[PDB]
Amino acid sequence: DPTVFHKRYLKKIRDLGEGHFGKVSLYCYDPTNDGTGEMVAVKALKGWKQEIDILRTLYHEHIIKYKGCCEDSLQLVMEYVPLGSLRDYLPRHSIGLAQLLLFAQQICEGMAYLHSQHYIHRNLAARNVLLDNDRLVKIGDFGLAKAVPEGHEYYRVREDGDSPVFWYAPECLKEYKFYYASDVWSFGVTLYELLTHCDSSQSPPTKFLELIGQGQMTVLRLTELLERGERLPRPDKCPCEVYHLMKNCWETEASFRPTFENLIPILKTVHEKY
Ligand SMILES: Cc1ccccc1-n1cc(-c2ccn(C)n2)c2[nH]nc(N)c2c1=O
């Protein structure tokens, strides 16, 4: 059985990031001592194992590949995505706009599948969308991902620690209810990030805080500003056609947002424009 990795052949290289509930690091796995073995990403895990059992059930060219784990409180071993998050990639190479859209499209394709499998990612951001060799997109960090019980469209989570609250839809901040349609929202927020090339002095949190005037009175107020109808600016050089698409993902009422199913053909249509 290949999905069992032996702690005795994982020599580490460097840390990679902080994931949700786990630190992540690059490892070289050589169980045959042939002198090269294989390259993998390992997430040191702290119901805290849920990332594992979800990712294990998913097979898709835009979701990060589950390779197996590691035991002695345990450790997720994933396919290695060489180029890291777009959050770091974008602000450091200039990219075409058509290219920015083709990435958006790909995240929809993965997300559509995720949802078709009855999961919510709960964490979709430029941070957590990784690039491989051919510039193919892979959705990562399933730290917050959740099973949606069959029969229902949402799922209630009372947060313990940090939440990407600036990527979340009202229903989530307001009521702690996450629908499939909440991932669509976040996808909208991501799409903005893409088109701001993740410039940090353009990021969602810096923008939303300007709109107000920090503190723990923020989430109440941010709910109130999203609820009054205010949104992120139209990124510079971002076309109307696109900014509308985002705005649609940002419908206040979840039942009004488009689905990932629908987003796919619409994005192919628009990527084709340029
Ligand atoms: C998505 C995420 C969230 C949180 C923490 C780590 C990652 N993360 C980061 C990378 C990475 C960082 C730098 N580089 C060059 N690559 C990576 N590569 N391959 C993977 N599976 C993965 C990965 O999960």
From Swiss-Prot:
Q: Which residues bind ATP?
A: L16, G17, E18, G19, H20, F21, G22, K23, V24, K43
Similarity section: Belongs to the protein kinase superfamily. Tyr protein kinase family. JAK subfamily.
Consequence of substituting Y154F: Reduces basal catalytic activity and abolishes IFN-dependent activation
Q: How is it modified after translation?
A: Phosphorylated. Phosphorylation by JAK1 at Tyr-154 and Tyr-155 induces kinase activation.
Keywords attached to this entry = ATP-binding, Kinase, Nucleotide-binding, Phosphoprotein, Repeat, SH2 domain, Transferase, Tyrosine-protein kinase
| UniProt keyword DNA-binding, yes or no | no
Disease (UniProt): Immunodeficiency 35: A primary immunodeficiency characterized by recurrent skin abscesses, pneumonia, and highly elevated serum IgE.
Q: Which residues of the full protein are shown?
A: 888 to 1176 of 1187
Q: Name one GO molecular function term.
A: protein tyrosine kinase activity
Where, per the database record, does this protein carry Phosphotyrosine?
Y154, Y155
Question: Which residue range or ranges hold the Protein kinase domain?
Answer: 10-274
Described by its record, this protein's role is as follows: Tyrosine kinase of the non-receptor type involved in numerous cytokines and interferons signaling, which regulates cell growth, development, cell migration, innate and adaptive immunity. Plays both structural and catalytic roles in numerous interleukins and interferons (IFN-alpha/beta) signaling. Associates with heterodimeric cytokine receptor complexes and activates STAT family members including STAT1, STAT3, STAT4 or STAT6.
An example of a Gene Ontology BP annotation on this entry?
positive regulation of type II interferon production
Biological classification of the source:
Eukaryota, Metazoa, Chordata, Craniata, Vertebrata
Please report the name of this protein according to its UniProt entry.
Answer: Non-receptor tyrosine-protein kinase TYK2
Q: What is the effect of changing Y155F?
A: Reduces basal catalytic activity and abolishes IFN-dependent activation
User: GO cellular component annotations, sorted alphabetically?
Assistant: cytoplasm; cytoplasmic side of plasma membrane; cytoskeleton; cytosol; extracellular exosome; extrinsic component of cytoplasmic side of plasma membrane; extrinsic component of plasma membrane; interleukin-12 receptor complex
Q: Cite the active-site annotation.
A: N123
